[PDB]
Amino acid sequence: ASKVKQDMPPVGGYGPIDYKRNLPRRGLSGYSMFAVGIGALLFGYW
Amino acid sequence: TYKYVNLREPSMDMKSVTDRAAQTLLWTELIRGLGMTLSYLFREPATINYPFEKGPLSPRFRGEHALRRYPSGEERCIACKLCEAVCPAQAITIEAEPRADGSRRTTRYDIDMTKCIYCGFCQEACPVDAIVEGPNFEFSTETHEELLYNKEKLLNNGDKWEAEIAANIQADYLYR
Amino acid sequence: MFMINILMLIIPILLAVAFLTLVERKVLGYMQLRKGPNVVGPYGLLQPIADAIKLFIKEPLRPATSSASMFILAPIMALGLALTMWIPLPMPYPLINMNLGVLFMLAMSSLAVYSILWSGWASNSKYALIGALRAVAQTISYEVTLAIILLSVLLMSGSFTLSTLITTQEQMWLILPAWPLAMMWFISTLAETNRAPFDLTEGESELVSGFNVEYAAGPFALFFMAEYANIIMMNIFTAILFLGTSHNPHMPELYTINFTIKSLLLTMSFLWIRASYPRFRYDQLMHLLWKNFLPLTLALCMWHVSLPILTSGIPPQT
Amino acid sequence: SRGEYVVAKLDDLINWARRSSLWPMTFGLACCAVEMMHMAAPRYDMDRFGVVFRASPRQSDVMIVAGTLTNKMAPALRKVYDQMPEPRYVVSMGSCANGGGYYHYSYSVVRGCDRIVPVDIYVPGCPPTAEALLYGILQLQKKIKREKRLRIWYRR
Amino acid sequence: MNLMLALLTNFTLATLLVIIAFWLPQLNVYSEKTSPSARLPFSMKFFLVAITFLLFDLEIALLLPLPWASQTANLNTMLTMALFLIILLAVSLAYEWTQKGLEWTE
Ligand SMILES: CCCCCCCCCCCCCCCCCC(=O)OC[C@H](COP(=O)(O)OCCN)OC(=O)CCCCCCCCCCCCCCCCC
Ligand SMILES: CCCCCCCCCCCCCCCCCC(=O)OC[C@H](COP(=O)(O)OCCN)OC(=O)CCCCCCCCCCCCCCCCC
Ligand SMILES: CCCCCCCCCCCCO[C@@H]1O[C@H](CO)[C@@H](O[C@H]2O[C@H](CO)[C@@H](O)[C@H](O)[C@H]2O)[C@H](O)[C@H]1O
Ligand code: SF4
Ligand code: SF4
Ligand code: SF4
């Protein structure tokens, strides 16, 4: 007899699926940013 | 279970207040949005080169109608009118009588392709796989009258597309 | 000889505008994961030509204008002023070397608001006129910061001569000493030319934005050419002002190549921005000017008057 | 250097420009508008053919009727058509616009938009696939390519 | 002479493009169609933004000579009067701001 064959998940299921929000952290601190910007002005002024 | 989408109170220390001031003045979160569109600029686009390339379809696709035959060339349609009864749009008009040899065959089989909703109910209802929706979807016309198919048009579609229609039926009839 | 020089400026300007329309559609296309024009000519290189022919043989619109003279004057003024803005630009040598070239460019751009006003008057539509008045209010508002920002930078240059900005930046781009002014300058040019996110004439908040509304207008192509000529010109002005290119008198072409690249990149950033952000509300872009840029621009003007004096860095007058 | 030759080549030029720069005014009435939006989306990118996505009715050259035209809506559709500058073309997209479709027998539905405006291309389907609509637009381009306005003028 | 020639050329071409933009469509000979003061009402706010632009624009006229003014020997006087003008420009904004002259809500 031919066994039943229909669309089914693979043995052991499927692998994990991500869904949570992921917005990574980037850049420098506020202090560091303002330091770089002020340093640029001073060098330009000089 | 539920979660809050927007119930975070910002911290009010120097480190944090100055981080938010930097964002306001230095436009950092706006620059971040520019980064995302720049990244897309360097991605391969998803555009296919139609009509040299075609969007993928499946054997179940519901396209232009066609009337089929048996391998001998005899028509499959025996004018039962199940298709005309089920048609949600009343797009099918059938008349029938005994053929010269006594066979039960249609003398009219019209589909108003501008009434049809391309639902595929007719091919589900047909007891002999006579009427099908084939794979053709490129049959737009310049006049309204060209979309009122009579039996001759539909038999011609069957003879035109049978090679593909038969293979698609072979691929899906075990799901039916 | 001079007549050749004029035509060697006007004609390339019109061609750059034509092909900027293609660059905009392809750059916006690829940022949107698609291609944009690539069928009409190889890589869409004939698309500007097909659009130009198509527009000029299209039927003129209805309804009829309220004022025939103002209907005709507005496009003449828009395009005439747009081309005029190019004549003092040093690339590296100007067509017309003006001692007050920067002031000339300010003065001519302040006249560009008349085409908006006249085309609204000639639209024969009450709602279209109200749309024109909102556009004028936006334009003149952001003219205030452009003038004050420009004055602040010239305090480091020392004169109103455009080619003196080249000498001023011989050692270093002015964007370093003046990046806060460059930021507000660049946004003001976007708002001045009614570019996204400041393109409310093409937005959804106008009384005439409804698709089924109609009013006297056109020709569309001539107004469109004038607008895009100003986009390029403003970005050329931005490069000269803040990203000065070194000029070698014996190899002027090197200036032109480097100067053209910077202008192109700045122009592409206009397209970049249009792809990236939603549109401002009218009251919000007024708030941006009057309650953010203007207070900071006045403060930075005070600073740039004082800074050369207190550092003993006043520039020369000649 | 006959006038027939020059008129023939001038026809090809203006026909080329008009079909290569087709600006549609999409009248998104119902479901079919979704497939029209999938024709603009990245996979098919109608803009790559010179067919700008969102164009104002003042500059549009073709009206696409994408959905059911009800009686209450018919006057507004005719008004837009009358305000389109020429040359103007109409594409009827989907069963509803073609002939009423599923709602053909309704008291409130116009049985085909060709009772209101002249239609150049009929695109069948409920809805036509985005590719089917694109096929229809390319069919309109070839119809424009066949135009002979100047040849007919020359023989008047 | 050159500037006059440039202005004449620029506005001459703009004029020719405009008239041919209006005549060239008449080659098609399209069919005939045969189918079509007072307040606006104007908001006071739109008038007041225009007036504010003007008064701010007049103060900018007084600030334009600043690049030349910095070449003077009397720098202390010049700097005092330059900052005085810009500050009064700021005071005009502050007065407008704190009397809700910059609002768009009715
Ligand atoms: C030593 C001392 C020397 C003294 C001088 C020291 C000065 C340095 C410290 C000051 C820094 C000044 C920064 C200058 C930028 C102006 C800041 C600004 O006004 O942005 C805030 C504005 C409003 O922000 P919002 O959060 O909406 O509301 C706040 C008001 N309630 O929001 C905005 O303006 C956002 C921008 C709106 C437009 C968005 C679309 C464009 C974004 C992309 C631009 C990319 C960068 C362009 C760079 C071009 C350079 C050529
Ligand atoms: C048509 C395309 C042409 C381009 C061709 C290809 C070349 C690409 C070059 C473009 C470079 C910009 C693209 C990359 C931008 C994306 C990087 C990024 O996302 O950084 C985000 C970073 C973090 O932001 P955030 O998460 O909010 O953190 C806040 C507290 N840390 O945010 C930041 O750190 C921002 C730091 C910079 C802030 C500077 C503020 C503006 C100052 C104006 C100076 C402009 C100087 C440059 C102008 C050009 C002259 C060279
Ligand atoms: C020698 C050169 C001769 C001049 C040639 C001029 C060719 C002009 C080609 C334009 C190509 C299409 O370019 C595109 O047009 C449409 C207008 O329909 C613009 O569309 C924009 O303006 C219209 C209103 O005017 C809005 O309804 C629309 O929402 C907005 O996006 C796009 O911002 C622009 O990217
Ligand atoms: S597909 Fe549906 S609507 Fe069309 S003829 Fe068959 S049953 Fe009728
Ligand atoms: S097509 Fe099939 S269902 Fe319809 S009348 Fe013929 S045999 Fe019956
Ligand atoms: S034809 Fe079909 S898909 Fe299109 S509007 Fe009508 S019911 Fe919807």
Tell me the HSE value of B26 on the side-chain side, using a 13 A CA sphere. 20
CB contact under 8 A, A43 and C176: yes
- For residue E101, give the DSSP letter: T
Answer whether C34's CB lies under 8 Å from B46's CB: yes
- What number does the ligand 4 atom closest to the CA of D102 have? 3
Please tell me the distance in Å from B29's CA to the nearest CA on chain C. Answer: 11
Give nearest CA residue, ligand 6 atom 8: D31
Touching, A vs D (3+ Cβ pairs under 8 A):
no
Rounded to whole angstroms, the Cα distance separating C101 from C163 reads: 9
SS (H, E, C) chain B: CCCCCCCCCCCCCHHHHHHHHHHHHHCHHHHHHHHHHHHHHCCCCCCCCCCCCCCCCCCCCCCCEEECECCCCCECCCCCCHHHHHCCCCCEEEEEEECCCCCEEEEEEEEECCCCCCCCHHHHHCCCCCEEECCCCCCCECCCHHHEECHHHHHHHHHHHHHHHHHHHHHHHHHC
A22 touches chain B (CB under 8 A): no
CA distances from B20 to B13, B29, C292 (A): 11, 10, 16
Tokens encoding E24: 């060239």
Burial class (CB in 10 A: 0-12, 13-18, 19+), B33: middle
Tokens encoding E105: 């809500």
Q: Among positive and negative, which fits the CA dihedral C143, C149, C153, C155?
A: positive
The per-residue DSSP string of C127-184 comes to HHHHHHHHHHHHHHHHHHHHHHHHHHHHHHH-SS-HHHHHHHTSSS-THHHHHHHHHH
C-alpha B119 to ligand 4 mean position (Å): 5
Short-list C265, C91, C72, C104, CA closest to C186: C265
Answer whether D27's CB lies under 8 Å from D65's CB: yes
Tokens encoding C149: 């920002």
Rounded to whole angstroms, the Cα distance separating C97 from C94 reads: 5
CB atoms within 10 A of CB C99: 13
According to DSSP H, which parts of chain C are helical?
2-31, 47-56, 68-84, 101-110, 113-121, 126-157, 162-168, 175-192, 220-242, 252-274, 282-288, 294-311
Answer whether D150's CB lies under 8 Å from D7's CB: yes
Please tell me the distance in Å from C137's CA to the nearest CA on chain B. Answer: 25
Which value in Å is the resolution of this experimental model?
A: 2.3
Rounded to whole angstroms, the Cα distance separating C167 from C171 reads: 8
The per-residue DSSP string of A8-40 comes to -PPTT-PPP---S------S--HHHHHHHHHHH
Short-list C112, C88, C105, CA closest to C150: C105
Rounded to whole angstroms, the Cα distance separating C192 from C197 reads: 11
D47 to chain C: which residues are within 8 Å by CB?
25, 29, 34, 36-37
Rounded to whole angstroms, the Cα distance separating C187 from C273 reads: 10
Determine the residue of B86, B119, B133 to mutate for testing ligand 4's pocket, defined as the one with the most ligand atoms within 8 A of the Cβ atom: B119
Query: Helices C2-31 and B28-41 sit at what angle, rounded to 10 degrees?
Result: 90
Rounded to whole angstroms, the Cα distance separating C215 from C224 reads: 17
Could you tell me if residue E78 is inside a domain? yes
Q: B110 φ, ψ to 5°?
A: -110, 140
Q: Per-residue b/e over D76-99, b at no fewer than 16 CB within 10 Å?
A: ebeebbebbbebbbbbbbbbbbbb
CA distances from B8 to A21, B18, B110, B161, C250 (A): 15, 18, 65, 62, 63
E58 CA to centre of own chain = 11
Short-list D25, D21, D101, CA closest to D69: D101
Number of domains in chain E: 1
Element (DSSP H or E) covering residue D28: strand D24-28
Short-list E67, E72, E58, E78, CA closest to C160: E67
CA distances from A39 to A16, B28, C66, C170, C175 (A): 47, 18, 58, 21, 13
- Considering only the beta carbons, identify the residue of A26, A29, A37 that sits closest to B19: A29
C-alpha B60 to ligand 5 mean position (Å): 19
- Considering only the beta carbons, identify the residue of A26, A27, A30 that sits closest to B21: A30
Short-list B145, B164, B174, CA closest to B64: B164
Instruction: Tell me chain A's radius of gyration from C-alpha atoms.
Output: 28
Rounded to whole angstroms, the Cα distance separating B33 from C275 reads: 10
Q: B173 φ, ψ to 5°?
A: -65, -20
D82 touches chain E (CB under 8 A): yes
Rounded to whole angstroms, the Cα distance separating C242 from C245 reads: 9
CA distances from B86 to B83, B116, B123, D13, D99 (A): 5, 12, 10, 52, 20
Rounded to whole angstroms, the Cα distance separating C122 from C65 reads: 5
Short-list C210, C211, C207, C200, CA closest to C279: C200
Rounded to whole angstroms, the Cα distance separating C70 from B82 reads: 69
The β-bridge partners of D90 are D63
Least CA distance to E6: which residue of chain C?
C6
First to last CA, chain A: 90
Could you tell me if residue E62 is inside a domain? yes
B44 to chain D: which residues are within 8 Å by CB?
none
Rounded to whole angstroms, the Cα distance separating B169 from D31 reads: 29
Burial class (CB in 10 A: 0-12, 13-18, 19+), D11: buried
Q: Among positive and negative, which fits the CA dihedral D79, D84, D87, D90?
A: negative
E9 touches chain C (CB under 8 A): yes
Rounded to whole angstroms, the Cα distance separating E64 from C110 reads: 15
Q: Does the Cβ of A27 fall within 6 Å of ligand 2?
A: yes
Q: Among positive and negative, which fits the CA dihedral B99, B103, B104, B108?
A: negative
CB contact under 8 A, A45 and C172: no
Rounded to whole angstroms, the Cα distance separating D65 from B3 reads: 43
Name the neighbours of E, counting chains with at least 3 Cβ pairs within 8 A: C, D
Burial class (CB in 10 A: 0-12, 13-18, 19+), C286: buried
Ligand minimally distant from the alpha carbon of residue C307: 1
**What CA dihedral angle connects C238, C243, C247 and C251, to 10 degrees?**
-90
Method of elucidation: cryo-EM
Rounded to whole angstroms, the Cα distance separating D128 from D135 reads: 10
Report cis status (omega within 30 of 0) of the bond before C180. Answer: no
- What number does the ligand 5 atom closest to the CA of B79 have? 5
CB contact under 8 A, B26 and A37: yes
Mutation target to probe the B interface, by most B beta carbons within 10 A, among D126, D135, D143 is D126
Element (DSSP H or E) covering residue D90: strand D89-93
Q: Which residue do the tokens 């800074």 mark?
A: C307
Answer whether C135's CB lies under 8 Å from C201's CB: yes
Could you tell me if residue E24 is inside a domain? yes
Rounded to whole angstroms, the Cα distance separating E78 from C305 reads: 10
Answer whether B87's CB lies under 8 Å from B121's CB: yes
- How do beta strands B131-133 and B65-67 pair? antiparallel
The β-bridge partners of B141 are D122
D24 CA to centre of own chain = 7
Answer whether D50's CB lies under 8 Å from D21's CB: yes
Element (DSSP H or E) covering residue C97: none
CB atoms within 10 A of CB C207: 14
Rounded to whole angstroms, the Cα distance separating B26 from C279 reads: 20
Could you tell me if residue E2 is inside a domain? no
Answer whether C145's CB lies under 8 Å from C293's CB: yes
Rounded to whole angstroms, the Cα distance separating C31 from C27 reads: 6
Rounded to whole angstroms, the Cα distance separating A30 from A10 reads: 50
Tokens encoding D127: 């809805």
The angle formed by the CA atoms of residues A12, A15 and A20, to the nearest 5 degrees, is 140
Could you tell me if residue E40 is inside a domain? yes
Q: Among positive and negative, which fits the CA dihedral C228, C230, C231, C236?
A: positive
CB contact under 8 A, D20 and C38: no
Query: Which amino acid belongs to residue C74?
Result: A
Q: Which residue do the tokens 């695109």 mark?
A: D123
Tokens encoding B85: 């009864």
Tokens encoding E40: 């606006």
Could you tell me if residue E105 is inside a domain? no
C181 touches chain B (CB under 8 A): no
Answer whether C205's CB lies under 8 Å from C282's CB: yes
- For residue C96, give the DSSP letter: S
C-alpha B61 to ligand 6 mean position (Å): 17
C-alpha D32 to ligand 6 mean position (Å): 5
Q: Which residue do the tokens 């979807």 mark?
A: B137
Q: Per-residue b/e over C143-167, b at no fewer than 16 CB within 10 Å?
A: bbbbbbbbbbbbbbbbbbbbbbbbb
Q: How many CB pairs under 8 A join C and E?
A: 149
Could you tell me if residue E72 is inside a domain? yes
Tokens encoding E11: 């506005």
- What number does the ligand 6 atom closest to the CA of D95 have? 1
CA distances from E96 to B106, C105, C204, D26, E58 (A): 85, 30, 29, 46, 16
Could you tell me if residue E93 is inside a domain? yes
Rounded to whole angstroms, the Cα distance separating C152 from C298 reads: 9
Rounded to whole angstroms, the Cα distance separating E49 from E101 reads: 9
Residues 6 or more apart in contact with residue B70 via CB below 8 angstroms: B76
**Edge-to-edge, what's the strand order for the sheet holding B92-98?**
B92-98, B104-112, B148-149
**Which residue range forms the structural domain that includes residue E74?**
7-98
Query: Which amino acid belongs to residue C11?
Result: I
Residues 6 or more apart in contact with residue C67 via CB below 8 angstroms: C121, C122
E87 to chain C: which residues are within 8 Å by CB?
302
Q: Among positive and negative, which fits the CA dihedral B27, B28, B31, B32?
A: negative
- Looking at residue E79, which CATH number applies to its domain? 1.20.58.1610
Q: Which residue do the tokens 């104007």 mark?
A: E42
Element (DSSP H or E) covering residue D82: helix D74-83
Give nearest CA residue, ligand 2 atom 7: B38
